[PDB]
Amino acid sequence: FTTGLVYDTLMLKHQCTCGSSSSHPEHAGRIQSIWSRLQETGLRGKCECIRGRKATLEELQTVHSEAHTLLYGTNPSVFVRLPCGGVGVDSDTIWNEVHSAGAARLAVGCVVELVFKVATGELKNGFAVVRPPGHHAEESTPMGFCYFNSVAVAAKLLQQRLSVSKILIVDWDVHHGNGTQQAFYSDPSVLYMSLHRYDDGNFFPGSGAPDEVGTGPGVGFNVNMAFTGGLDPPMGDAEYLAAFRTVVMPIASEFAPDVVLVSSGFDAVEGHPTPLGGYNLSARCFGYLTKQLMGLAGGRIVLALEGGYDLTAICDASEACVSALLGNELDPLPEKVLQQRPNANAVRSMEKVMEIHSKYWRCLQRTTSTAGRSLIEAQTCEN
Amino acid sequence: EGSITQGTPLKY
Ligand SMILES: [K+]
Ligand SMILES: [K+]
Ligand SMILES: [Zn+2]
Ligand SMILES: [Zn+2]
């Protein structure tokens, strides 16, 4: 069955007026380079071309308050004059008074159109080359280059329109997705699962402690795989693959989702500036992480772009992910990755997360505690 | 006030 891609050049229009491209890492060229890489590699010809649309204000209001959708979804004060000279709500999130409202709605709508085409069976899986990223946005607070939470809106719309009972949201963007967590913090029917640098709250945005397990009926359905200890050593492929083998897959498998949405951030890839990420994930590792998620929910999966700001890194990672969604055979993992053990900081983080969520997920016992094993050592003991 | 550009967490 066909994989689907969605992309629109109107999202390029979301740009600061200052004319200083260096000051805004979330710039229009992040998706243009990605779409160009999908064309030159021939992957775009293997996928269906999905046309986007702007999200309706009622669609945005499933997640955000009406005052938030009217402030940032429409045009004729929270706005301020930035040091760069452009308008914005804060130093991070610039606002173009002409084009930005149509770009944010187009990003939410391209994700909703792709997710519904996969959920309804018009596509096997999808990948959304969309900007601005949405996972940091809250019910009324834009932040982190985010305005509307595109993944959260597509998840709420899957419930209110298709009555899906189980929805898995993986968030492997290096930053915690505070808005995707807040949107479903009390909902058993949606399992949020964020992998992020945390360092005891000393990283942006500072939320996402392992103890934050959800509330009310939704207790135990929010899994924060929070890494800690800084970049000493920085997390690599062996640490993320171990977190999937020990924490992500066992919990997602017991949840048995009907759908899998992914906040596909690429700022964890190697070569990023340290404040924006600092992890050394290979782009080839993200292709394997995509293929492991493809076994869930019958293959009903959609990846939506979030973070990731180095152009060569997000292009290599978008290529590996779409190549994985197509069923293409992966490049084999290097022997240094298969044999490397996770660093002790990643082991202390995984075991701390497993200690909290073993109370809620019965199958988080077989992996307690295999967190320190290398992938070859785990394949040895499982035989 | 923290920033995503600097990696600085939000705090009050
Ligand atoms: K995350
Ligand atoms: K939840
Ligand atoms: Zn500017
Ligand atoms: Zn990010």
Residue numbers in the entry:
A (entry chain G): 652 to 727, 744 to 1050
B (entry chain A): 7 to 18
Can you list sentences taken from the study reporting this PDB entry?
Here, we found that two conserved GSI-containing motifs of SRD3c are critical for HDAC4 binding. Two SMRT peptides including these motifs commonly form a β-hairpin structure in the cleft and block the catalytic entry site of HDAC4. They interact mainly with class IIa HDAC-specific residues of HDAC4 in a closed conformation.
For the SRD3c protein, we designed two peptides (SP1: −3HIRGSITQGIPRSYV+12, SP2: −2KEGSITQGTPLKY+11), which include the GSI motif in the sequences. Consistent with this, these peptides inhibited the in vitro deacetylase activity of HDAC4c H976Y, with a better inhibitory effect of SP1 than that of SP2. The hydrophobic I+3 residues (I1363 or I1459) are at the β-turn near the catalytic zinc ion and intervened with F812 and F871 at the end of the cleft and entrance to the catalytic pocket of the HDAC4c. At one side of the cleft, a water molecule (w4) mediates the interaction between the carbonyl oxygen of I+3 in both peptides with the side-chain of H842 of the catalytic subdomain. At the two loops of S744–W762 and H803–G811 of the structural zinc ion-binding site, D759 hydrogen-bonds with the hydroxyl group of T+4 and peptidyl nitrogen atom between S+2 and I+3 in two peptides. Notably, D757 interacts indirectly with R+9 of the bound SP1 via a water molecule (w8), which is missing in the SP2-bound structure with L+9 at the corresponding position.
